[PDB]
Amino acid sequence: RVDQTPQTITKETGESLTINCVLRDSNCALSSTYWYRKKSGSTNEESISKGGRYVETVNSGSKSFSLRINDLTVEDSGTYRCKPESRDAECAALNDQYGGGTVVTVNAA
């Protein structure tokens, strides 16, 4: 199970936010990690390219990974989710588990 927190975030333009995910109840190693977002109202789930304003931090030992997004704009509003992937029947079945989502609101400032 992927525990993603918080469930909602509201920030002003220019601020930053951090989402945290932890893979629990699994024997699987945290090998690879992915982040996705669907812009508010949109159909399209987009992959998030790590780097720049999107700063991922990983702790392999605790199977925790977080995304800090800096310099927020209105266009960052959306639903975000995380997904681990493992290199074991169970671990093929970690590349099917996602975090439960974070609704992000960034207000014009």
Could you tell me the domains of the chain?
1-109 (2.60.40.10)
The span from the CA of 75 to the CA of 3, in Å, is 25
Residue 12 in tokens: 């002003």
For this PDB entry, the determination method is X-ray
86 class by beta-carbon count within 10 Å (0-12 exposed, 13-18 middle, 19+ buried): buried
Resolution of the deposited coordinates, in angstroms?
1.9
- Bridge-based pairing of strands 45-47 and 102-107 is unpaired
The span from the CA of 58 to the CA of 93, in Å, is 21
